[PDB]
Amino acid sequence: PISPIETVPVKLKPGMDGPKVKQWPLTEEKIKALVEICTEMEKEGKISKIGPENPYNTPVFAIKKKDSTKWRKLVDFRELNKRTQDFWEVQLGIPHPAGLKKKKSVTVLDVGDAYFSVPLDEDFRKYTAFTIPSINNIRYQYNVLPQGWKGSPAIFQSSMTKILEPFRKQNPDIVICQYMDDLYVGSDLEIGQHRTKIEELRQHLLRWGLTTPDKKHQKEPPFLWMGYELHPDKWTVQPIVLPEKDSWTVNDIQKLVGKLNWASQIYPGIKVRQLCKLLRGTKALTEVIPLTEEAELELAENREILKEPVHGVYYDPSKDLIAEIQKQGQGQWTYQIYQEPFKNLKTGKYARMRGAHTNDVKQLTEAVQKITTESIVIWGKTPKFKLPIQKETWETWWTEYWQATWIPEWEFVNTPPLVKLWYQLEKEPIVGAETFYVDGAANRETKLGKAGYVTNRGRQKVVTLTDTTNQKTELQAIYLALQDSGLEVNIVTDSQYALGIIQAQPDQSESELVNQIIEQLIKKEKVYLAWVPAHKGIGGNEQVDKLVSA
Amino acid sequence: IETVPVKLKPGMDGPKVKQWPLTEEKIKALVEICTEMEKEGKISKIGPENPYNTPVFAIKKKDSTKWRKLVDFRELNKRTQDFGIPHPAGLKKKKSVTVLDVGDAYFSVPLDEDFRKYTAFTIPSINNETPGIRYQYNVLPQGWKGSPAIFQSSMTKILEPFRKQNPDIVICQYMDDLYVGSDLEIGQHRTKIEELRQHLLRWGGYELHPDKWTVQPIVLPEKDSWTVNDIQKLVGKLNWASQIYPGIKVRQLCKLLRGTKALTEVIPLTEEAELELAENREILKEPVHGVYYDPSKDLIAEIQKQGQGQWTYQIYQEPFKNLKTGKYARMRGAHTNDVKQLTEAVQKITTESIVIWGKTPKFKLPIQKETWETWWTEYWQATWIPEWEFVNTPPLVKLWYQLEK
């Protein structure tokens, strides 16, 4: 079954030459076999003997495939693959289960060794040369796509799309999806009708040397789709097995946390905090670790979660898309996309490493965005959103934030906890509030600093700092101010980072100190923050500022 | 026709840019659009043996509810050899200018066989249920820099008559568009324009107002009485501003600010401070001297969001030596979404840069990459695509321009 299809022109990378590697020596039985096997496809026209006019060579091997005490062959194109041009995209990204519309029925045709049905570019064939040695010290080359060579998949995919354009056209109410050597076909016809067509298709591929496993020997639903179990009217989350064991090695924990993390997507509730703690300091990937009781209760509670299997539904184009979001903790969000309430299409969660300085709204914002993207990738469209935030809140925040931001049509859902603004700086000074002129300075090299303040009420403080830095000093100045102020405060500072907070008003940060201030900001009733150019006369920057520079 | 050979700047290789996900709605439109151009033999299906790719997408101009296909050749233009096309300085002054979409023209002209591979692009498939759909151009593509180039000859011809019979009218072509400027009152301009269309059709509001784009001065507040705060705010701004006008002085004012007083405390101005201030207001009445466009350097465009629907910008080549600056108020209807406002803004500004220096500025956008990548196209309406980078607006450069008159 070679095929009568136009070969795709293939050439070697810019200015390189074919493979030239030596052939390993072989046992009497590793040569005997390969002679047989090769004489086989030799007769099938798949490979053709070559003379000495071919200077290339690839190492052929022989490994007896398991569950058959018979011999099989293997050719090592590592080198050839390094020398072969690149092709576009053998996989623009995988179709997710939630992006499929349901079907009355779905077959799958293993187009298996169709890799060998497609003839290789006559010109290129010469680089595929390999050698079968003899006992005490026989050449060939491929005439069809070799298994394991860079361009096969690619060449075979396109080949396939061509050969499918006709049948697809005639039968538009039918749906084929291809992937690898697996051809999935589904539809909404009546089983007998479906049956007929599949056969029709089969005899079509069958026409291009493309042998396919008959009805008598093909696969049947459910279908294990990398992670999922697929029925034509519902998919399932193929229950995950946590190895209950005696002693745990570091490596084991990692793998475990790995599978656990994967799970948290569909199973929010899953936790790995204490389990992660078990790695701190680990000296060897195989050193065994004592499972803290906290880690026990956790590992445990996780098995319970993974008990309940999870089935979902498919895409129904005649219904709107809804995306609902929840905040599980600081910078942790869960979302579920569905068409009919509680009938979920997809779910997920996100952990946001605080990074420099953020705030929940900003983070809420990023979630939406991420969701929006994957939605489009799947349903070529974006969901209407149900968000745990009030229009008032959102409005206040965005019209004022310094960065461009946006949230597609959405609707407030009162599912607590809601995301809110933890504090807001006053737009102008507070009348009848103490005014703290803060300043901080530190010796860059010796890391010795002082921080402090003086108010218009005559109050003052100063503090000496060991092993500190400038930024810290400045911030500290501000921390103190806040600590000693009271519900309403006015604070002038010449800090560049103060400018930061003002413009962003973050409610989370990597810097503990910042967090400190943030906590203090939140406590205050009314706070107004002001910045003035450093080292200028601006009193305050002259008095508390003078006390801290030498 | 006989085709001119186009090549890549030496050393370069074709573009291999990934396709961005597209909505169902626009993927459909592109298919239609492509099957058609295919028949029309403008484009042809390609195999995987071709590894180059450029992003594609669809948009709709105003007063057009018919989808239009747009490609992102930036990368390819960057890699396409240069050749030399002349820019006036007249429309810069015209009383009015009108832009014209002559992208079509190109589809008549064929493209050198060997450069075609480089023009490969891909229509994706929703959820990847199908493999993508690869095409490649056979004629001059719209949006490519080589196209207005190769179609130069024919173009000049086609126009000369309208040219010679109207040397009082300016015509500048920048890629897919044609800029027509005349001081003739609107009546004659509009009519003369339509006459020009016909002149072209023959072969096979909306108005612009150049002049009027005068840079604005930085006005300073005025109060009956000033507070510690007011001053501090003022002084802060002046201080920073001195980087532009070095004659600005702040000491007399900073003197009043000595002593730890309350922000709300009122302070009367010394006659010395009064002067220092009056003297500053003067210097600010006009743009800094010495700023002259340099054709050999990149034009830069910075945008600050001011909130309330307002945005400010500055075109320059060297920080603080602005060539142009300005304010922009949100178009009627974008009352809830930033991204819409920003693209509109981006487009208007690019426009001016073209009209003026006949060159697209590189943008410095106050928006997170992801946000921008996800939605800019949704509101884009120009055949060209400028360069951009994403940044963090310093708080000061913002308070400054907020002060523009």
Ligand SMILES: Cc1ccnc2c1NC(=O)c1cccnc1N2C1CC1
């Ligand atoms: C794994 C896979 C990838 C893409 N599409 C499908 C499948 N397999 C199915 O079993 C399936 C299930 C439900 C709907 N379409 C399906 N099919 C469609 C092709 C008939």
